[PDB]
Ligand binder design. Structure first.
Ligand SMILES: [Mg+2]
Ligand SMILES: [Mg+2]
Ligand SMILES: [Mg+2]
Ligand SMILES: [Mg+2]
Ligand SMILES: [Mg+2]
Ligand SMILES: [Mg+2]
Ligand SMILES: [Mg+2]
Ligand SMILES: [Mg+2]
Ligand SMILES: [Mg+2]
Ligand SMILES: [Mg+2]
Ligand SMILES: [Mg+2]
Ligand SMILES: [Mg+2]
Ligand SMILES: [Mg+2]
Ligand SMILES: [Mg+2]
Lengths: 184, 266, 98, 73, 196, 49, 293, 123, 125
RNA sequence: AUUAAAAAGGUAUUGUUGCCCACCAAUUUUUAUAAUAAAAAUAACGUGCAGUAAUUAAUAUAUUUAUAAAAAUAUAUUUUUUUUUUUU
RNA sequence: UAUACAAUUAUCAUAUUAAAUUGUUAAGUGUUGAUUUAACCAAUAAAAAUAUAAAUAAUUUUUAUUUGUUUUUAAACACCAUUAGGUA
């Protein structure tokens, strides 16, 4: 029978089944395409893919799509799950702020420590320890140091991990990325 | 009793009173250690950042001009408020003045049915990045819910301290040992030190203190990788058993055994 | 117009059309325009810096990415599953009667 | 039905202050000493003539954060 | 005196009438319990019932905060390891130990960095216990039923719009394409419940 | 803090006055990296002076 | 011991616990210590033979320079100097990053009366108050920041569209001519064997299956492509790549591996555009009912 | 320590009035005649001077006085009362306990429940 | 009262037409976003209070300094004279103004009346 | 030369070898007698295993189904256990 | 046998000052086939997005009006039965 595109049985391969829509070039997906990336010359498409997937996963879009596209759930269970999600979020936010309000204190104590180092060894000395080019006679030394800093600052492409999808038996959640039990 | 922000039972601060740096450091102060002291100056009255959302739900976002273009005919300005898929952000992620939300969902609707915006996807996604506050990991915004960035800067500054410490331990080391190139037999040596300390010991010049040393080094050339022919016993055809392998006794005192460990899948 | 020419040509090749260029107008001299050229090339330079470094050669990068994906695959395979995933229906029914 | 662990020993968050407030001890001790059968402790011998401040009220009884309750703090 | 006012000789000192009928509550709060451990309901650390609480739900994610041992965990050195990996993959004729030296330097520092972060985090656990945590004494805020009153306020509104009638009522879900499959004269969109 | 040069380097010219700061930067230039916690530590290093 | 596993080595008390620390290892050879000491000492003297700030400064003789500092010119100068440094510094200790930015800007800059409008004038201009605060660039605005199709794919009559669809228990790949004609059939994780009567369903839609399938498909895809091109007279004899658009569906494990099997073909296939078409359900017909709801 | 460091603006602590308040309350915390909480709330609620806040606007900006008078008085009281067998110990301990707390995050604020004796306590 | 929708309590000290706060059909309160400055979310807002504390300020008299000429020349703006003070001021409450009940609570959804918050659009001016 | 700690439910009450649920016989007693009346006491026999987050979580309404607890579906819901993107 | 509810906050069935109601959009063919499922069996598969303001407060609507059951499958999903169909 007619299935939607995100349906389980959507694109079937069988003797009866035949795919629907213009399937190439200007296609069935014409204005329905969620992402587009022009591949930068000499860039493997694996970085492209892992960037896309990290994006979708961190913003909880792949969560949503997996969730809704597998089973039906009544508007009550959907509400319960979404608002539960959002309230757990709220709680953990109010935890993060506490942690952060402490870590800014820690960072302060560190900077203070740095001040005490300053008036033990004198300011200029401390600056020397931190990579100040006081030994730079001419610009060529400067350009060596700054060439070093350039070769550091240039960012090698980050390969960001995407948690695998866990296929369980009757699939209570197809959002399952871990083996922990969940409240449905 | 609860503070509003994270529910703290106190009001946050670092210092309060005018005297505390003095009184804490008092012996140093009479001594006169504290004269050029920049630690008792810089941080003396230093207080915590304001970590607060002045807009918990932004009535500020967007600034006024933007509203003009939140209509159906500005695909770009629609796009700066969506995800890269075109969906809206949940309220507690990207908060918007309710006017903007109305105008925006209406806009995307209209634009879609007129063919001026795609049913999925954000066509302006890259162009719009200027308008979003992309936050560099190198700057620090005192207000973030990012717990990573905070600890990153903590790391950074602490390591900036460690650098100093290491610089000045290797310096004084270099001068204690370089004094020997300055004075060979000049002085600093006791007769009793000649008795006790001139013998080999673990602090002086031990042989090696650890198992698996390197003995018998030679210049011989590398061999061909995998010179060894596979054994006659097939490791491939054997199946690995973990849980039931040995016999165990359960320390479970009372109650039914947890159904998630065993008796569940997978 | 130049943004659309690729797809127009790809859909109906037989169709003949020209890339349409706006009528040009110059502010000041060719000097201020050459300075506009320096500005656009400089912005393309800060953006050429910021965009991606991508090392040097492609295949040498792809090898690394695929390697670390593999290592993550086999550090994953060592995680404990849940009891329910692991056991058959046999022992489920056994524990049920029990 | 799961509940936060220590709810058994949970303090009364409105009234747990009352017990400790200076006026209460002033009154109680006041009618204890009045009996003639109790030797007054010395703090009473003192605050007898310097009774504590009137209008300092807790935030528990008055639910106002903006009320500046104490002349001191 | 020699110890706490909330704890007498035989256990927690029983103030409310619940303690006198149920005096198991005085001497046993769990399997992390000791006798000095009464009245301090949280037990030691690394110990059973040592976890601090935030608005009643316990804090079991601490390491995940400072980014030690988490999936989202903070990584110190990336550029190095990538650089070195690139070196290994490119060619075998030239071998660069320069990269491996920059990297092993990086690691050598990383160790002390991590011990520092851990120490600072334990100080955070201490501070959080002193000045924030309620010690599991307040009602959970983190699940929707705890907020029932909030939702009630919304149901009430949709009722007063309906002439103060249908509480908890919602529009009948129609069909995937109810609007275009129905003939003139039948409702093509879901109405307010009172409007039925 | 006031009148405190925050960016000062060792190739900066020596300040004229005697302050813990000026003297410590000076000493860094003269002795190299020799630094002692207190005066009796210096008298320790010179041994009998 | 008995029907139970042996303890790990670290669970036994130390094997040498009864041997004193001076015995492990023995420091023998003490006889030689003194010898080498003398030796080294001797060598030091040898190394001198190869090879081989307390300038009294009187404070009275400086006086001329001090008198130079009593002049109000030099004090005007120290005033200007100290008033320029008195603005609040945000710098604190020396920073590498900011130094680098500073000097990079110095390299970039080395490579490099009319009546004041009063408050009343800006009282009368409503526009100006809105220009000062506006986000909108004033001047000629770049057109590439307007047009809809600026950031979007640009196709060609010769392009091949590769479909990688990752499903939950399955993965498959297909390829299509730009004009929509199907090239090769759909190679599927269950079509290639690789699926049934086997290890389990858990691993059926896994990464490595997607890889097996895609890498099996491309292998069979090249020759048929060269035949379909030989039919219209496009030889593509040598030194050519197929310009490919990879369209990926599904957010399932089998996706990762799939694209990897494209990336190792980079010497044959050239990917211009990577765009994923993944259906999103705003709402629609009911999905099949699961267990709980 | 609490009376010294935990109270913004406890008047001028050298004056014989407030000084006597503190003295009496101290002798009442020793010898167990009062709870610590009760004696603290007694101290901060004690009678000082009419229009107290508005005289406080003529000295303090944010209402935080200087802490020297507090510590000198608090040591004085322990000396004049016979609190310790050896005289110095009073001053030393009162000083030391403050110096250690100086390093703590939000050092001079306290949660009201844990600040003093209550049913549930800290370890 | 443990019944939901009865949580707002019995307050007499409000200005509404019932002493039972939870039968009042005018202002429905918001338990999640309210009560930063007022303490509990039940209690009346700073500007609507009909009962006043000892050490707390009472309402500002609205103006809508010239008239202090006889006073201390330095005396600044009197703390109780305000330019904008509205005893009738609608505070944004989600369950009233943004009501997500008839929806699945997805990001854009819920019905909104804009008559509450003053328009920050540039369209008006 | 391949390690463990910290969050959790009980209709039981020395506590799962714990309790309980309906039909299926006798009898007792009131009545507003619907396949075979209804309701209440009740300690047999025989089915099972419905419930105590309890072997596909429960609860309420709705509709269907039926040896018996009950089960299927449509909605609301926690007297069910939680897992937490402030524009990437 | 007679011999003193509450009226400041009490969850199952006696509602009541309220602004709604109406919108014609989307989606579909290339070709030789193991899709879905823990597992069975029937067997073309794609899809249906836009509205605020405004309506005045109370005093005789209680036989009135009102609280998710709905024509059209020659349109599907979904659900129920099991290849015959029901329902949607
Ligand atoms: Mg059919
Ligand atoms: Mg339960
Ligand atoms: Mg318990
Ligand atoms: Mg416990
Ligand atoms: Mg009868
Ligand atoms: Mg009967
Ligand atoms: Mg059962
Ligand atoms: Mg059941
Ligand atoms: Mg059950
Ligand atoms: Mg039920
Ligand atoms: Mg049955
Ligand atoms: Mg039922
Ligand atoms: Mg059910
Ligand atoms: Mg009734």
């Amino acid at each position: 029978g007619g299935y939607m595109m995100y349906h389980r049985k959507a694109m079937g391969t069988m003797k009866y089944s035949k795919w629907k829509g213009a399937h190439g070039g200007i296609s069935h997906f014409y204005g329905r395409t969620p992402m587009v990336e022009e591949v930068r010359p000499n860039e493997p498409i694996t970085l492209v893919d892992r960037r896309i997937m990290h994006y979708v996963h961190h913003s909880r879009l792949r969560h949503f799509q997996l969730f809704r596209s597998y089973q039906e759930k009544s508007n009550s269970t959907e509400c319960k799950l979404r608002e539960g999600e959002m309230l757990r979020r709220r709680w953990h936010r109010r935890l993060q702020k506490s942690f952060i309000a402490f870590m800014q204190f820690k960072t302060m104590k560190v900077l203070e420590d740095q001040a005490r180092l300053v008036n033990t060894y004198g300011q200029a000395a401390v600056n020397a320890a931190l990579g100040d080019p006081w030994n730079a006679t001419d610009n060529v030394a400067r350009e060596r140091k700054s060439a070093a800093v350039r070769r550091q600052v240039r960012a090698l492409p980050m390969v960001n991990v995407v948690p695998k999808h866990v296929a369980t038996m009757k699939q209570i959640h197809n959002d399952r990325f871990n083996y922990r039990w969940r409240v449905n | 009793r609860e503070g509003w922000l994270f529910g703290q039972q106190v009001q946050l601060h670092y210092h309060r009173f005018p005297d505390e740096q003095l009184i804490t450091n008092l012996s140093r102060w009479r001594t006169g250690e504290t004269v050029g002291d920049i630690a008792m100056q810089q941080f003396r009255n230093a207080q915590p950042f304001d970590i607060e959302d002045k807009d918990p739900q932004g009535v500020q976002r967007p600034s006024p001009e933007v509203y003009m273009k939140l209509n159906y005919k500005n695909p770009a300005t629609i796009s700066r408020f969506l995800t890269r898929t075109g969906h809206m952000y949940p309220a507690d992620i990207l908060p918007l003045n309710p006017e903007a939300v109305v105008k925006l969902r209406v806009a995307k609707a209209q634009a879609i049915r007129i063919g001026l915006y795609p049913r999925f996807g954000n066509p302006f996604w890259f162009r719009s990045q200027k308008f979003r506050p992309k936050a560099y990991q190198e700057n620090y915004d005192p207000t973030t819910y990012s717990t990573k960035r905070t600890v990153e800067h903590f790391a950074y500054n602490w390591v900036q301290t460690d650098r100093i410490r290491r610089y000045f331990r290797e310096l004084e080391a270099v001068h204690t040992s370089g004094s020997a190139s300055a004075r060979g037999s000049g002085g600093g040596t006791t007769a009793e030190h000649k008795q006790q300390d001139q013998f080999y010991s673990p602090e002086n010049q031990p042989i090696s203190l650890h198992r698996n040393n390197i003995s018998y080094m030679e210049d011989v050339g590398r061999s061909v990788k995998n010179p060894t022919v596979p054994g006659l016993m097939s490791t491939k055809g054997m199946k690995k058993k973990f849980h039931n392998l040995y016999s165990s006794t359960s320390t479970k005192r009372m109650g039914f055994s947890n159904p998630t460990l065993g008796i569940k899948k997978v | 117009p130049e943004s659309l020419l690729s797809n127009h040509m790809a859909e109906h090749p037989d169709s003949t059309a020209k890339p349409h260029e706006p009528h040009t107008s110059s502010s000041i001299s060719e000097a201020a325009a050459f300075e506009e050229r320096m500005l656009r090339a400089m912005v393309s330079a800060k953006e050429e810096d910021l965009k991606e470094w991508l090392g040097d050669d492609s295949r040498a990068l792809s090898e690394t990415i695929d390697d670390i994906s593999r290592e993550e695959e086999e550090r994953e395979a060592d995680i404990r599953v849940a009891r329910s995933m692991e056991e058959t229906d046999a022992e489920r029914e056994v524990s049920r009667r029990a | 039905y799961k509940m936060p662990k220590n709810m058994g020993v949970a303090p009364r968050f409105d009234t747990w202050n009352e017990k400790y407030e200076p006026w209460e001890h002033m009154k109680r001790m006041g009618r204890l000493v009045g009996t003639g059968f109790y030797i007054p402790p010395e703090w009473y011998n003192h605050f007898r003539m310097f009774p504590p401040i009137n209008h300092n009220f807790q935030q528990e009884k008055t639910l106002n954060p903006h009320n500046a309750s104490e002349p001191t703090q | 005196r020699q110890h706490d006012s909330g704890v007498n000789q035989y256990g927690l000192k029983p103030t409310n009438a619940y303690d006198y009928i149920n005096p198991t509550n005085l001497i046993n709060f769990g399997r992390g319990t000791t006798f000095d451990n009464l009245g301090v309901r949280r037990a030691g650390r690394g110990e059973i019932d040592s976890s601090p609480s935030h608005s009643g739900s316990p804090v079991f994610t601490q390491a995940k905060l400072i980014g030690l041992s988490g999936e989202e965990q903070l990584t110190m050195c990336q550029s190095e390891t990538m650089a070195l990996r690139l070196c290994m993959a490119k060619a075998g004729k030239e071998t660069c130990e320069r990269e491996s030296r920059a990297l092993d330097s990086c690691l050598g520092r990383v160790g002390h960095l991590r011990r520092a972060m851990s120490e600072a985090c334990w100080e955070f656990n201490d501070w959080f216990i002193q000045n924030v945590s309620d010690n599991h004494t307040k009602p959970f805020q983190h699940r929707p039923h705890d907020w029932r009153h909030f939702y009630a306020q919304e149901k009430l509104v949709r009722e007063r719009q309906q002439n103060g009638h249908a509480y908890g009522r919602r529009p009948k879900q129609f069909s995937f394409g109810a609007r275009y499959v129905k003939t003139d004269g039948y409702g093509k969109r879901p109405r307010l419940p009172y409007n039925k | 803090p006031a009148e405190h040069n925050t960016l000062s380097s060792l190739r900066d010219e020596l300040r004229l006055d005697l302050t813990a700061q000026s003297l410590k930067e000076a000493w860094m230039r003269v002795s190299g990296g020799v630094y002692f916690q207190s005066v009796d530590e210096y008298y320790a290093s010179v041994d009998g002076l | 011991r008995r029907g139970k596993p042996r303890p790990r080595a670290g669970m036994f008390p130390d094997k040498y616990r009864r041997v004193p620390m001076l015995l492990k290892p023995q420091q023998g050879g003490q006889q030689y210590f003194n010898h080498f000491l003398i030796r080294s000492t001797n060598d030091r003297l040898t190394q001198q033979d190869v090879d081989n700030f307390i300038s009294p400064q009187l404070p009275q003789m400086d006086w001329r320079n001090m008198s130079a500092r009593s002049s109000e010119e030099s004090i005007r100068e120290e005033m200007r100097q100290l008033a320029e440094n008195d603005v609040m510094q945000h710098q604190r200790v020396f920073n590498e990053r900011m130094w680098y930015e500073k000097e990079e800007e110095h390299r970039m800059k080395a490579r490099s009366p009319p009546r004041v409008l009063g408050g009343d004038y800006f009282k009368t201009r409503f526009g100006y108050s809105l220009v000062k605060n506006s986000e909108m660039t004033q001047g000629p605005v770049d057109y590439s920041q307007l047009d809809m199709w600026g950031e979007m794919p640009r196709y060609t009559s010769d392009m091949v569209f590769l479909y990688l669809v990752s499903r939950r228990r399955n993965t498959y790949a297909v390829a299509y001519t730009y004009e929509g004609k199907r090239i090769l059939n759909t190679y599927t994780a269950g079509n290639r064997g690789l699926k049934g009567g086997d290890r389990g369903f858990r691993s059926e839609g896994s990464t490595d299956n997607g890889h097996q399938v895609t890498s099996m498909y491309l292998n069979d895809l090249l020759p048929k492509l060269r035949e379909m091109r030989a039919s219209e007279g496009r030889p593509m004899g040598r030194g050519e790549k197929v310009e490919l658009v990879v369209r990926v569906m599904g957010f399932y494990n089998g996706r990762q591996g799939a694209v990897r099997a494209v990336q190792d073909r980079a010497n044959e296939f050239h990917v211009r555009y990577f765009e994923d078409i993944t259906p999103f359900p705003l709402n629609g017909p009911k999905m099949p009912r699961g267990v709980f709801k | 320590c609490h009376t010294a460091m935990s109270v913004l603006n406890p008047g001028d602590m050298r004056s014989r009035l407030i000084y006597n308040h503190l003295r009496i309350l101290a002798e009442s915390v020793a010898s167990g005649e009062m709870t610590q909480r009760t004696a603290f709330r007694f101290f901060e609620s004690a009678v000082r001077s009419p229009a107290y806040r508005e005289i406080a606007k003529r000295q303090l900006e944010g209402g935080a006085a200087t802490r020297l008078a507090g510590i000198s008085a608090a040591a004085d009281v322990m000396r004049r009362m016979g609190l310790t067998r050896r005289p110095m110990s009073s001053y030393f301990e009162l000083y030391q306990r403050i110096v250690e707390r100086s390093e703590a995050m939000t050092p001079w604020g306290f949660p009201p429940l844990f600040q003093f004796e209550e049913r549930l306590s800290l370890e | 009262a443990n019944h939901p929708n009865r949580q707002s309590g019995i307050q007499f000290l409000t200005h509404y037409n019932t002493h039972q706060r939870f039968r009042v059909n005018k202002d429905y309160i918001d338990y999640m976003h309210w009560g930063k400055e007022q303490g509990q979310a039940r209690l009346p807002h700073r500007h609507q209070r009909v009962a006043f504390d000892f050490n707390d300020q009472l309402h500002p008299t609205r103006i809508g300094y010239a008239w202090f000429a006889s006073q201390d020349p330095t005396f600044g703006h009197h703390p109780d004279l305000s330019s904008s003070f509205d005893p009738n001021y609608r505070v944004f409450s989600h369950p009233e103004h943004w009501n997500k009940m008839f929806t699945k609570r997805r990001p854009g959804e819920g019905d909104i009346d804009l008559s509450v918050l003053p328009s920050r659009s540039l369209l008006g001016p």
